[PDB]
Short mmCIF file of C-alpha atoms in Angstrom, two decimals:
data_model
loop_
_atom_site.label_atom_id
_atom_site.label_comp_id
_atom_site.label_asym_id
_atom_site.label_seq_id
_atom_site.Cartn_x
_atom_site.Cartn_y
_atom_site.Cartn_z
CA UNK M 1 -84.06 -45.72 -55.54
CA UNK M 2 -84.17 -45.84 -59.11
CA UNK M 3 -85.56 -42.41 -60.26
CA UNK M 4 -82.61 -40.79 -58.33
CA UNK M 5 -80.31 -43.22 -60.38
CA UNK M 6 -81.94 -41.79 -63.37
CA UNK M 7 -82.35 -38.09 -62.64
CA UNK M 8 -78.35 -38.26 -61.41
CA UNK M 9 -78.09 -39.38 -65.30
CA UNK M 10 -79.58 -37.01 -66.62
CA UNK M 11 -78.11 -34.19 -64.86
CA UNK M 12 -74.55 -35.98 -65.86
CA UNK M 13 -75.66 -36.00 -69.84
CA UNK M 14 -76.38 -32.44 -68.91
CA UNK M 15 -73.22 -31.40 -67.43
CA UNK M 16 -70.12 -33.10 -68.51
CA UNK M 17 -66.59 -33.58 -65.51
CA UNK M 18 -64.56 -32.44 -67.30
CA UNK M 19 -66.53 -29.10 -67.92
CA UNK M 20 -66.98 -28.75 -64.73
CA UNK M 21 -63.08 -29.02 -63.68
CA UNK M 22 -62.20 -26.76 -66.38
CA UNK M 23 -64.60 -23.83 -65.15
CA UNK M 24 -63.20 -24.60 -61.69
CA UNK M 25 -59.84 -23.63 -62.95
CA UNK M 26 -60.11 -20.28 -64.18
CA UNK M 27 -57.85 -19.49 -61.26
CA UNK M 28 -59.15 -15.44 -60.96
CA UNK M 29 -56.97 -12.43 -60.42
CA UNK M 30 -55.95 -11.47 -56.57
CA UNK M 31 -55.40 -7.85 -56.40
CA UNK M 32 -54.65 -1.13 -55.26
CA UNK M 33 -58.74 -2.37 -54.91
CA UNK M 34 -60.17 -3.88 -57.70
CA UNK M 35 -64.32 -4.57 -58.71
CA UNK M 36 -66.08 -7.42 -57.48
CA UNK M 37 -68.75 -7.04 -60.48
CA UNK M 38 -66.41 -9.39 -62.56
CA UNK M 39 -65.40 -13.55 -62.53
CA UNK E 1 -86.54 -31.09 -57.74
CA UNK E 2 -87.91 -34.14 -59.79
CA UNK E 3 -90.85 -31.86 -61.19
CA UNK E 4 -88.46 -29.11 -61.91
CA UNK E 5 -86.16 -31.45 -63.93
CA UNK E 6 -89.04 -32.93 -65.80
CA UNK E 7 -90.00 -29.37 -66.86
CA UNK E 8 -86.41 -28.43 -67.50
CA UNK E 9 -85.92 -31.31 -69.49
CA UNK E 10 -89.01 -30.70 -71.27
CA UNK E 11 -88.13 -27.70 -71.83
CA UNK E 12 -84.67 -27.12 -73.63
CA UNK E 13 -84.28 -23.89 -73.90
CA UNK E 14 -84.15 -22.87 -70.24
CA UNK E 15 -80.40 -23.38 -70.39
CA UNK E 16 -78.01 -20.67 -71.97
CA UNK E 17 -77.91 -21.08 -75.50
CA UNK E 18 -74.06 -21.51 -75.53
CA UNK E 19 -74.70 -24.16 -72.94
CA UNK E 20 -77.39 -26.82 -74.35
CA UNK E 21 -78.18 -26.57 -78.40
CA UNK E 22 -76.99 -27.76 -81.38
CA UNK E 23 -74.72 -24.27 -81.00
CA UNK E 24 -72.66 -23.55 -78.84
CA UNK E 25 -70.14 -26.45 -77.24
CA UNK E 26 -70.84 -26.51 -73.90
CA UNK E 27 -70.47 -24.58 -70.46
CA UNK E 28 -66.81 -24.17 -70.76
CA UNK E 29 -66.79 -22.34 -73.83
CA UNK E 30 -69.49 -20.46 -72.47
CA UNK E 31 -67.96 -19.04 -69.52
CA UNK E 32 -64.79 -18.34 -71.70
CA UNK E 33 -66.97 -16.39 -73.96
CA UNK E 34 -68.28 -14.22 -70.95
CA UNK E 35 -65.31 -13.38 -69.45
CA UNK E 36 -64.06 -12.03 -73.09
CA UNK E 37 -67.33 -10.18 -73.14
CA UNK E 38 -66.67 -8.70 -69.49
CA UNK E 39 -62.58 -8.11 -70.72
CA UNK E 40 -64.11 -6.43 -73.63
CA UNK E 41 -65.98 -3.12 -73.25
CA UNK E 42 -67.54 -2.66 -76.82
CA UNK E 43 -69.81 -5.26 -75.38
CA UNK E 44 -72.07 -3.90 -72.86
CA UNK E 45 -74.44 -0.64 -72.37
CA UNK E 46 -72.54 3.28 -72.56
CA UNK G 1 -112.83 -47.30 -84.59
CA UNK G 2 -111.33 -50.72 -83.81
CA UNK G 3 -109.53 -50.64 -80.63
CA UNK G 4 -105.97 -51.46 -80.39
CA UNK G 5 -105.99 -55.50 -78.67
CA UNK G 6 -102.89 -57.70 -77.85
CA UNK G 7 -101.02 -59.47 -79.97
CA UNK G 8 -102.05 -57.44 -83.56
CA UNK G 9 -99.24 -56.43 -85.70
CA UNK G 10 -99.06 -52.78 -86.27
CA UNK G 11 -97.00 -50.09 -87.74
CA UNK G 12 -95.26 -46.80 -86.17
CA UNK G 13 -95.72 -44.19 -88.96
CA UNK G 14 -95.14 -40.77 -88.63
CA UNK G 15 -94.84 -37.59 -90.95
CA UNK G 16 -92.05 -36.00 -92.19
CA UNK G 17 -91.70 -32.32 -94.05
CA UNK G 18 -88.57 -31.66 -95.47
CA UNK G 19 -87.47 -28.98 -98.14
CA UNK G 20 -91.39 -28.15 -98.12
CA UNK G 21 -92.42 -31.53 -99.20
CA UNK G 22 -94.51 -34.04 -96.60
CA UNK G 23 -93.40 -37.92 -96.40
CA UNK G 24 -94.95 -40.93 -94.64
CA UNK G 25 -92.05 -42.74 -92.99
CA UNK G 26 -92.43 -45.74 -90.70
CA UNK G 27 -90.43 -47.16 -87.96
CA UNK G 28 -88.42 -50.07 -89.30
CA UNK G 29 -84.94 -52.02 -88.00
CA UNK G 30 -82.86 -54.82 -89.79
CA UNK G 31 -82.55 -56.51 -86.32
CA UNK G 32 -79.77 -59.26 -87.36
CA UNK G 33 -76.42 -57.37 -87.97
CA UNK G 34 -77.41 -53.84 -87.13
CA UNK G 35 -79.53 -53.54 -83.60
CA UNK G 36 -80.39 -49.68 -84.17
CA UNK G 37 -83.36 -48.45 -85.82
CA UNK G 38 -84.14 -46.45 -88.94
CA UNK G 39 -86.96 -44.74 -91.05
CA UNK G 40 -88.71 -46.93 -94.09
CA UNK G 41 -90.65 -44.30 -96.69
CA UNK G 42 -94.12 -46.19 -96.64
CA UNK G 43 -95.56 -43.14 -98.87
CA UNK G 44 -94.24 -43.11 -102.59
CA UNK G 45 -94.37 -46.97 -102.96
CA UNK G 46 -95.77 -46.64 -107.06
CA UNK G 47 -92.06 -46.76 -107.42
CA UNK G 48 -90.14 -47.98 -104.71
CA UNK G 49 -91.91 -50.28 -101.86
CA UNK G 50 -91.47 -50.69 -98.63
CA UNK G 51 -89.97 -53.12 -96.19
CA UNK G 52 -92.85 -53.69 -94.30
CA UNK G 53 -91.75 -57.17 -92.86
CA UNK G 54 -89.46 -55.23 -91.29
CA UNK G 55 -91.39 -52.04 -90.22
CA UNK G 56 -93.91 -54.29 -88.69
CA UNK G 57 -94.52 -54.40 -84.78
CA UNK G 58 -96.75 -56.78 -82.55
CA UNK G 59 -97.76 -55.47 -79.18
CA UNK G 60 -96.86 -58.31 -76.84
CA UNK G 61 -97.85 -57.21 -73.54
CA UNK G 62 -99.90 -54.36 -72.36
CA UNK G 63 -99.50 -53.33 -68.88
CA UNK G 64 -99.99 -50.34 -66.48
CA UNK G 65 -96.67 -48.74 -65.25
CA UNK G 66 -97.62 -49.61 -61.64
CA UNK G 67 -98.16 -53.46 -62.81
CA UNK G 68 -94.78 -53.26 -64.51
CA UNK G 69 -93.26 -51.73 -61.28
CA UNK G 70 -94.70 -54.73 -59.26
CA UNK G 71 -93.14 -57.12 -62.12
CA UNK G 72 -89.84 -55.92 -61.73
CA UNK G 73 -90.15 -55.71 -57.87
CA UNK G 74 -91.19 -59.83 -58.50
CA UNK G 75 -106.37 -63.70 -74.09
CA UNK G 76 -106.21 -60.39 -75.50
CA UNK G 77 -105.88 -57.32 -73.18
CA UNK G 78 -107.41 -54.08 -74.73
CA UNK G 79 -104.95 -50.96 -74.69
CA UNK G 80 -105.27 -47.78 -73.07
CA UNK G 81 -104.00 -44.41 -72.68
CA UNK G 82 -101.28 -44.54 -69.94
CA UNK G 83 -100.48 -47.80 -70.26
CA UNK G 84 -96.78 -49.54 -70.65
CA UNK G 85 -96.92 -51.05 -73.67
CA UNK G 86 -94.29 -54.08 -75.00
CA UNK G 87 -93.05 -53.62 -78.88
CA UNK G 88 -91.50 -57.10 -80.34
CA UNK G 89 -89.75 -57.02 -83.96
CA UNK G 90 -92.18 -58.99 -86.43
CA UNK G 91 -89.23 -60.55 -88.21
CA UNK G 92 -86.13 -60.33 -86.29
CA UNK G 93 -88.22 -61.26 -82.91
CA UNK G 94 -86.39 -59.27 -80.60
CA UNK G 95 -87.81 -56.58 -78.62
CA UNK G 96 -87.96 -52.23 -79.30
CA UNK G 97 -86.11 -50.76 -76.41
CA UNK G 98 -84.11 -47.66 -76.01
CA UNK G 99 -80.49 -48.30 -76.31
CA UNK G 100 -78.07 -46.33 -73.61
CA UNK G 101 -75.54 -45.14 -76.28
CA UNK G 102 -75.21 -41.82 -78.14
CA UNK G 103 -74.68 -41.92 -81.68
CA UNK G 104 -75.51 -38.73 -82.59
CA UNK G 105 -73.31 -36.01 -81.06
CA UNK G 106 -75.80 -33.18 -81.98
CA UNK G 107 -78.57 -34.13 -79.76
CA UNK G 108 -76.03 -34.32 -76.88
CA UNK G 109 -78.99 -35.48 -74.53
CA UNK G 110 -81.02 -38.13 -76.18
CA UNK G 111 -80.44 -41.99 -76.57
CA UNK G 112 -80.45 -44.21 -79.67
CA UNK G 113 -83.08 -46.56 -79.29
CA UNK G 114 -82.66 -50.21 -80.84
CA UNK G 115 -84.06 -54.22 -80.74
CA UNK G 116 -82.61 -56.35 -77.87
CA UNK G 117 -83.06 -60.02 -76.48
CA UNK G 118 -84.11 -59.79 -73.60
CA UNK G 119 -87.32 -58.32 -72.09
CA UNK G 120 -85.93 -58.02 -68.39
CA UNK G 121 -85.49 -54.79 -66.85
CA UNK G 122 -87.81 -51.48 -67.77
CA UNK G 123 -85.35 -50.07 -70.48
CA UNK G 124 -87.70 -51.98 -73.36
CA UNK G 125 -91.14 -51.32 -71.88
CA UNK G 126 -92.68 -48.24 -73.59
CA UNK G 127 -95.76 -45.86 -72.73
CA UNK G 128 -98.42 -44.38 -74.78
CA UNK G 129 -99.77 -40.95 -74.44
CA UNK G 130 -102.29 -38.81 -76.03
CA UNK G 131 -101.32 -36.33 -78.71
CA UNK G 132 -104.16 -33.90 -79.19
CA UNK G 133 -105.97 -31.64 -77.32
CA UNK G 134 -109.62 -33.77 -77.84
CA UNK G 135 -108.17 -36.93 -76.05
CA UNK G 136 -106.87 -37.14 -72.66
CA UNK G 137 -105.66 -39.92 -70.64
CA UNK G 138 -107.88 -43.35 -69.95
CA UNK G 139 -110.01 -43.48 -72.97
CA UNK G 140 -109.45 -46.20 -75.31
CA UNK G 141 -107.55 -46.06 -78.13
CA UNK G 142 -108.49 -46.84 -81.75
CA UNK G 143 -107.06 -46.93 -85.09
CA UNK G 144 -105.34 -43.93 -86.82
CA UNK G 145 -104.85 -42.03 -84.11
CA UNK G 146 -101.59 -40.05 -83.15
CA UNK G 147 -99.81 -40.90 -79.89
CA UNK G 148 -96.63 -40.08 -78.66
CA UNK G 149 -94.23 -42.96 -76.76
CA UNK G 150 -92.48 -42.31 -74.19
CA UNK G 151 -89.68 -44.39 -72.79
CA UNK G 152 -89.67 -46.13 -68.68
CA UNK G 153 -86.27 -46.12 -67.58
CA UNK G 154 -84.72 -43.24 -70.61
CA UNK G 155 -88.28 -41.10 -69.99
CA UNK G 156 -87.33 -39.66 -73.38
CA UNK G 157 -89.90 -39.51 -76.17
CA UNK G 158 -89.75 -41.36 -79.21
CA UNK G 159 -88.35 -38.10 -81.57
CA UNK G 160 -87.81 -37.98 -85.06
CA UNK G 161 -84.43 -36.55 -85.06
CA UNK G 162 -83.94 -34.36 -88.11
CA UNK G 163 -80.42 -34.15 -89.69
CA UNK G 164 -78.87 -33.17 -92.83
CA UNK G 165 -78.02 -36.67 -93.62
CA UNK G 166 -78.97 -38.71 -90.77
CA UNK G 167 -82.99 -39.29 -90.62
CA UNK G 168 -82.84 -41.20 -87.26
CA UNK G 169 -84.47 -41.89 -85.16
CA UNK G 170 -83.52 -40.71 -81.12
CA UNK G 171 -84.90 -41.26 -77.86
CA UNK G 172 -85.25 -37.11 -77.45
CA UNK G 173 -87.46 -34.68 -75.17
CA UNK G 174 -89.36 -33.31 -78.45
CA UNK G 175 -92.76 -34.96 -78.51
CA UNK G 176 -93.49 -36.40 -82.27
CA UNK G 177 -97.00 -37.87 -83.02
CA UNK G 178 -96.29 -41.70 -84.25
CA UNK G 179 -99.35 -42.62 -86.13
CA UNK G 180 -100.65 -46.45 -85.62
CA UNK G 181 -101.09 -48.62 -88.85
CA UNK G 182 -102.96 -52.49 -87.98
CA UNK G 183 -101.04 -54.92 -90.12
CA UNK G 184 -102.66 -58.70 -88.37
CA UNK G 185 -105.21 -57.87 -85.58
CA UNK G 186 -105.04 -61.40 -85.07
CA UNK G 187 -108.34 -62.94 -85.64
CA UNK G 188 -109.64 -66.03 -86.56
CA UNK G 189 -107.29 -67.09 -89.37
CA UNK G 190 -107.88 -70.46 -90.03
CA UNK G 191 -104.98 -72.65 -90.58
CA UNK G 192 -104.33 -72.77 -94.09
CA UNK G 193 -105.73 -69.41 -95.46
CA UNK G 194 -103.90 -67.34 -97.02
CA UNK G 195 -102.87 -64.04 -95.45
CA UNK G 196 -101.38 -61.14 -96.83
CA UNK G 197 -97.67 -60.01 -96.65
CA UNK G 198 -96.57 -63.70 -96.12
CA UNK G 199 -94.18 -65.55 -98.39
CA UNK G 200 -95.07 -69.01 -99.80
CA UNK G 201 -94.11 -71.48 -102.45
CA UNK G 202 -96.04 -72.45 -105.59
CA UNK G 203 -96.42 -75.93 -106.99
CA UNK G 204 -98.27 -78.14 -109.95
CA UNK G 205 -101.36 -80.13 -108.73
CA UNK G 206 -99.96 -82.70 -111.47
CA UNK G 207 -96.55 -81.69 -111.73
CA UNK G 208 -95.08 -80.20 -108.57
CA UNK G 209 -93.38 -77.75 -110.85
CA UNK G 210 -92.17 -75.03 -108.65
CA UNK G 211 -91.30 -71.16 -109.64
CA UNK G 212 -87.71 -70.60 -108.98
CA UNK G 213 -84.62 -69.06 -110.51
CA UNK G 214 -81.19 -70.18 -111.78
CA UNK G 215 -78.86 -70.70 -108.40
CA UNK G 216 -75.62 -69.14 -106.94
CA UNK G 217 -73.64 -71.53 -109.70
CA UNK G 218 -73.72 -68.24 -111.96
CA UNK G 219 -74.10 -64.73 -111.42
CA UNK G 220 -77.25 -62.26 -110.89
CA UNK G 221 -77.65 -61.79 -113.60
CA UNK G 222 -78.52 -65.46 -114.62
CA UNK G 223 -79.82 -65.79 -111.41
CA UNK G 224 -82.51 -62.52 -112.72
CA UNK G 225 -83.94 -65.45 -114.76
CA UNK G 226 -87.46 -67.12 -113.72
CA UNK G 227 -88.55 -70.50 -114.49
CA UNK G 228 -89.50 -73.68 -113.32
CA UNK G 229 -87.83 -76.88 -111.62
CA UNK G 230 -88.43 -79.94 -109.61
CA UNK G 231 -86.93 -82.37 -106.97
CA UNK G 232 -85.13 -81.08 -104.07
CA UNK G 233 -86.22 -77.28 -105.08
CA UNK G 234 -89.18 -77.41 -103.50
CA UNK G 235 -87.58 -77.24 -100.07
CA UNK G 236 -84.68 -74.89 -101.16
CA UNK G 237 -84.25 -71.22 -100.20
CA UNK G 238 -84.54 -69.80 -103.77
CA UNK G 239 -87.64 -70.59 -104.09
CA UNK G 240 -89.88 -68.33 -101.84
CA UNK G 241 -92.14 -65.63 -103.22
CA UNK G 242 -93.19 -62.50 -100.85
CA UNK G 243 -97.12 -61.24 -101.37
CA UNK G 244 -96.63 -57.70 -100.67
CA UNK G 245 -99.63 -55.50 -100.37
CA UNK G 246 -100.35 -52.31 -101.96
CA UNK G 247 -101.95 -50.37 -98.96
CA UNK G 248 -99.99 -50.02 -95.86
CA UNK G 249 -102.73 -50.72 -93.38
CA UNK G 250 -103.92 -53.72 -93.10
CA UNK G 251 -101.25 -55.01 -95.61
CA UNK G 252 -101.81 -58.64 -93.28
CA UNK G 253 -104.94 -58.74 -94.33
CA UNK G 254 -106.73 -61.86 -95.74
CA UNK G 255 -106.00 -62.33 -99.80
CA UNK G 256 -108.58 -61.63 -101.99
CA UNK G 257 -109.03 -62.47 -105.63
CA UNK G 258 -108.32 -60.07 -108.55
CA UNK G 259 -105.94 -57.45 -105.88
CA UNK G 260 -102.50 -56.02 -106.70
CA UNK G 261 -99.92 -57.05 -104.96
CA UNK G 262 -95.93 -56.85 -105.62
CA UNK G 263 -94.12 -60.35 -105.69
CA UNK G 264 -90.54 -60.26 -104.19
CA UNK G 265 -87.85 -62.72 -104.21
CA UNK G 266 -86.71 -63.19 -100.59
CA UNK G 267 -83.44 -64.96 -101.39
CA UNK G 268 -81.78 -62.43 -103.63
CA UNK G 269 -84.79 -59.51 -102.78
CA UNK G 270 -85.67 -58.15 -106.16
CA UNK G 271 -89.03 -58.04 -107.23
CA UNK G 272 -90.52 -59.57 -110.02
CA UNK G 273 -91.15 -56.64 -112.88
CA UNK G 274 -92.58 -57.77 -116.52
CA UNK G 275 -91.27 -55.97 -119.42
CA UNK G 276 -93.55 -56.69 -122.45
CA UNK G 277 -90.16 -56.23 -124.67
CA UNK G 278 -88.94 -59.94 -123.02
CA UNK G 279 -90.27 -62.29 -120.16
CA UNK G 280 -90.55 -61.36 -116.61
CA UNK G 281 -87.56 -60.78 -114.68
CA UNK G 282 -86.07 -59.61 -111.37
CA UNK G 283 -85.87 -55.77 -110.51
CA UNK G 284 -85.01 -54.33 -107.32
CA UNK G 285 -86.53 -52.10 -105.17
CA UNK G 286 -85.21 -48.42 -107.21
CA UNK G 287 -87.02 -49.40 -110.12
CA UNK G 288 -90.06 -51.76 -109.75
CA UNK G 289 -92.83 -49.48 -110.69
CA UNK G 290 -96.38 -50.71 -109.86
CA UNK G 291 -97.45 -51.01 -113.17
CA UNK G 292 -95.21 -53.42 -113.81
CA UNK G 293 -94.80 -54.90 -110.53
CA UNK G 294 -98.79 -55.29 -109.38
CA UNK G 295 -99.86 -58.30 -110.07
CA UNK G 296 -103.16 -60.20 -109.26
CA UNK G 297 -105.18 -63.96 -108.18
CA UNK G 298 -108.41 -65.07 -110.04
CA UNK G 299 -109.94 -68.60 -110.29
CA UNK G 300 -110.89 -68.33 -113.92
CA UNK G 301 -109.10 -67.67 -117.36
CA UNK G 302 -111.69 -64.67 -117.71
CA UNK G 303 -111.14 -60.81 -117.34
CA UNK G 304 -114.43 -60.17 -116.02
CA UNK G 305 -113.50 -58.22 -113.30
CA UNK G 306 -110.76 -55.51 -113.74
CA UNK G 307 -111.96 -52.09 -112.12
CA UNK G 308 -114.34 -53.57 -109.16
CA UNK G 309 -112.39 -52.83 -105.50
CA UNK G 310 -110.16 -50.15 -104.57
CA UNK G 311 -109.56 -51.05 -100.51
CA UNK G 312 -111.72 -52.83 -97.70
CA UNK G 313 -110.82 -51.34 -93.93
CA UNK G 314 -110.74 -55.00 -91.97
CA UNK G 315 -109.22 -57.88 -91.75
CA UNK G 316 -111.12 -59.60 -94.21
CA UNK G 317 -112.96 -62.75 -95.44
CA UNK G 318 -111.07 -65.97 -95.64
CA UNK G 319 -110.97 -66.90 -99.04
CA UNK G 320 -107.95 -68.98 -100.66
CA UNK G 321 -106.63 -71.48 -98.62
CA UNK G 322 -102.82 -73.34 -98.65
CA UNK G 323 -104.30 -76.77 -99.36
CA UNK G 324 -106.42 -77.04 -102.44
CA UNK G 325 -106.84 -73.99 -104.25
CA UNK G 326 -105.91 -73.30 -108.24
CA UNK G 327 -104.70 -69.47 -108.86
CA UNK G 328 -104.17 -68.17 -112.30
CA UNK G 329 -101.90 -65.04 -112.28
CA UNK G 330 -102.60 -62.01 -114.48
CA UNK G 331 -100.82 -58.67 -114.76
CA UNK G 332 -102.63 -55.23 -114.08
CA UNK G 333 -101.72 -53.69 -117.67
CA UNK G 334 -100.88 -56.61 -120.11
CA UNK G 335 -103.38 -59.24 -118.30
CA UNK G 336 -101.25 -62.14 -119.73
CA UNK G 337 -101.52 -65.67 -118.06
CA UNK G 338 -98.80 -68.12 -116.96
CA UNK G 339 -98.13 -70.93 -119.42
CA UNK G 340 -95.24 -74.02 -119.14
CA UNK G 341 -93.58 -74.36 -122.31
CA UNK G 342 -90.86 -76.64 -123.61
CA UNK G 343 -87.94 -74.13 -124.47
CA UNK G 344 -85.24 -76.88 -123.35
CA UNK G 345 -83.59 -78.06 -126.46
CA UNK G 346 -83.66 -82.25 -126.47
CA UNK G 347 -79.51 -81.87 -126.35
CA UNK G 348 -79.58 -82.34 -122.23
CA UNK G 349 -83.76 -82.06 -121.42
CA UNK G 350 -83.65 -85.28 -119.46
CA UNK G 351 -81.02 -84.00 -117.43
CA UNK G 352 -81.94 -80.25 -116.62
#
């Protein structure tokens, strides 16, 4: 189908790779209890 | 999900402003910004 | 109230306010060396005209998006709301499409849209839909009203991108009304009228002495000289004079005596300005006012009629034809007349 081709697209010019893999790796703090309100 | 990405689409500023704009960069910079604001107290409601 | 057919040149305008002043600015593209699109300032032409030849558009095909979807699976059409219309370049006869690069980092989600070759594939097709509140979709559409286009395979509207320096336009998901001008609606023009905003070539009935300028054997500014020659001129390239059109709608309309129009000089592209202190000579586009730009067609010597027309909405009556038909020129504020003369000393006459 071509409307998936394009919506996949348009989500992509939305959301860049390599801003994804750079959220990914925030690599969070593993904690003495800490809060789980947080990253 | 097609009718909720026209409308999205249509709509720009659904997404966070440091997100989509002619502002702020993009998501990563975002995020950064958030957990800055979460690291930093003078930021949020005494 | 004339409805948009097939095959009629038109023009995309749209409006424009910036630093609190409104501007008329078409859609136009150079086509041969640069494929994208820019904006052509139609309004304020008393001193500066526009390139309509190449902000000009003819509707080549007019087709539902369901019979488009069937053509890619595999006279004179009227248009319609809804409809996927087809966009060819007057001039540079490629097609409008919407062009799958990103110029423009700001708008990190539109497209640039451009002319390209081919017509295959639904990136070039384009759809029409109703602006306004008043209209909705499946009526008819006639002249001066605002639509807004919307792209087939990009589904981004046609959106005047604002920018500090850049006025481009983008293929963007902000709706902006473009405004339809008729140029041609592509009547019955007889074969050998004449028609407005073409270029021709004039010539003696007795003497096939044809208006021309000095060629690329010296510089502009001999070549900003105007007179006449003979021979092998007649089929050169520096020889071809542009009728442009005061009015931008229905600038393809048919000639009629005693109008203003600008003459430009497609080889080199100045325009031909008259300063009473000399002769006439070339100007460009930054400074050929209309007062000394506008000239006008009669078929007598007279200056009977001066202040008679203003603007006819149509296509008009044919009147002059290419064959046999003897103009006299005459300028809107001086109202001199053209005249031969024998300025070439007898020291190399035969010769040149």
């Amino acid at each position: 189908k071509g409307e998936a081709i394009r919506i996949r697209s348009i989500l992509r010019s939305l959301i860049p790779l390599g801003d994804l893999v750079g959220v990914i790796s925030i690599a969070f703090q593993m904690p003495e209890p800490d809060m789980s309100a947080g990253f | 999900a097609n009718v909720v990405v026209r409308l999205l689409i249509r709509r720009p500023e659904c997404f966070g402003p440091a997100l989509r704009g002619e502002g702020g960069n993009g998501l990563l910079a975002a995020m950064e910004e958030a957990i800055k604001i979460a690291e930093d107290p003078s930021r949020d409601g005494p | 109230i004339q409805f948009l057919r097939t095959d009629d040149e038109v023009v995309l305008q749209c409006t424009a306010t910036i630093h609190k002043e409104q501007q008329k600015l078409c859609l136009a593209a150079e086509g041969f060396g640069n494929r994208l699109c820019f904006l052509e300032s139609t309004s304020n032409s008393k001193n500066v005209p526009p390139d309509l030849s190449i902000c000009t558009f003819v509707l080549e095909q007019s087709l539902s998006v369901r019979a488009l979807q069937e053509m890619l699976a595999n006279g004179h059409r009227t248009l319609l709301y809804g409809h996927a219309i087809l966009l060819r370049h007057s001039y540079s006869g490629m097609y409008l499409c919407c062009l799958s690069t990103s110029r423009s980092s700001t708008d990190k989600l539109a497209f640039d849209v451009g002319l390209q070759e081919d017509t295959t594939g639904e990136a070039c097709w384009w759809t029409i839909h109703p602006a306004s509140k008043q209209r909705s979709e499946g009526e008819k559409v006639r002249v001066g009203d605002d639509l807004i286009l919307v792209s087939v395979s990009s589904e981004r509207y046609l959106h005047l991108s604002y920018g500090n320096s850049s006025w481009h336009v983008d293929a963007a998901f902000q709706q902006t009304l473009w405004s339809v001008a008729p140029i041609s609606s592509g009547s019955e023009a007889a074969q050998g009228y004449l028609i407005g905003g073409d270029v021709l070539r004039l010539l003696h009935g007795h003497m096939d002495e044809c208006l021309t300028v000095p060629s690329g054997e010296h510089g502009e500014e001999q070549r900003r000289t105007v007179h006449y020659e003979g021979g092998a001129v007649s089929v050169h390239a520096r020889s071809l004079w542009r009728l442009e059109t005061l009015r931008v709608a229905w600038s393809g309309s048919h000639i009629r005596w005693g109008q203003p129009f600008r003459l430009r000089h497609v080889t080199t592209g100045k325009y031909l300005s008259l300063m009473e202190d000399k002769n006439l000579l070339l100007m460009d586009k930054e400074k050929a006012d209309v007062k000394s730009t506008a000239f006008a067609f009669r078929s007598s010597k007279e200056k009977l009629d001066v202040g008679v027309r203003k603007e006819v909405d149509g296509m008009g009556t044919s009147e002059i034809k290419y064959g046999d038909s003897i103009c006299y020129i005459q300028h809107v504020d001086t109202g001199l007349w053209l005249t031969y003369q024998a300025v070439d000393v007898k020291s190399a006459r035969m010769g040149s």
